[PDB]
């Protein structure tokens, strides 16, 4: 009966942040207390929500947005926010209902001379709508000047690798992020309790 959280959180590999995973969770029982005061997790901010009251309260769906950023960017996995991530990788909506977990993952997701495999969208033509994902491999027009599709002056390839080394300072270390988002639109309850 019990919910498959251990596969989101205790996962082998995680999403680059432009390319952000999700599972929807349904038709199962959710003890969230083994998240809040798990306290293995660094950051833990609930919006719309007392983090007691959810642990016996009910939803149509829980959706669980697994991905990986720099520590200094964790500020942006939050409503009303601004800059590279909330603009170009993953937004949240301004009246978000849900929780935001991260934890420092330098021990895992850094390597000797830099893990390239987590990644982020620099520039984009406009800002993302709430829970937009983008995977564009398509050159950015910085200038008025045309691209010829040649990467070059004012003509930039819009994704980058972060390149996490363990010798980094704490803000430029990788944090693993989950975003539990809660809904109840109108057909039936599927996730509570006990």
């Amino acid at each position: 009966n019990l919910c498959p959280f251990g596969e989101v959180f205790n996962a082998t590999r995680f999403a680059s942040v432009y390319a952000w995973n999700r599972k929807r969770i349904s038709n199962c029982v959710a003890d969230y207390s083994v998240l809040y005061n798990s306290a293995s997790f660094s950051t833990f901010k609930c919006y719309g929500v007392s983090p007691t009251k959810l642990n016996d309260l009910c939803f149509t769906n829980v959706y669980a947005d697994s991905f990986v950023i720099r520590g200094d960017e964790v500020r942006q996995i939050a409503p009303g926010q601004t800059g590279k991530i909330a603009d170009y990788n993953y937004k949240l909506p301004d009246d978000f209902t849900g929780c935001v977990i991260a934890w420092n993952s330098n021990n895992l997701d850094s390597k000797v001379g830099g893990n390239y495999n987590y990644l982020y969208r620099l520039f984009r033509k406009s800002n993302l709508k709430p829970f937009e994902r983008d995977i564009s491999t398509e050159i950015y027009q910085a200038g008025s000047t045309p691209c010829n599709g040649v990467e070059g002056f004012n003509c930039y390839f819009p994704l980058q690798s972060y390149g996490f080394q363990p010798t980094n300072g704490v803000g430029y270390q990788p944090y693993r992020v989950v975003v539990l988002s809660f809904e109840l639109l109108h057909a039936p309850a599927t996730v509570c309790g006990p």
Partner: nanobody
Amino acid sequence: EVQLVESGGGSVQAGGSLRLSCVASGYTYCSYDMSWYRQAPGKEREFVSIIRRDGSTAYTDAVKGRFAISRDNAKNTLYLQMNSLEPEDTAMYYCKSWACSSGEYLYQGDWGQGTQVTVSS
């Protein structure tokens, strides 16, 4: 999952040519757009070229009208043809599968081991 692997590098005379070969394997729910990158060792890991699913190339201005990117999906093999090599184009060269989708499975991308290209006077 994908294991990518590069091949067909090494030392050569300036002005000559080389063909780099990115062999794939056990694949995913997607055809990934694919790219080449190099490490001008010192300068960071830097963009060389792309071919998409839709088949459009783009190249970095450095190698324009000198290098060429192509795939033979039969072999599941990706080609960088490099003509008119200078010593600047020494580096470890890497192939890069990108992100692509298919309805919830979300292939992140992968890099390969690389192959050292080397050029002289």
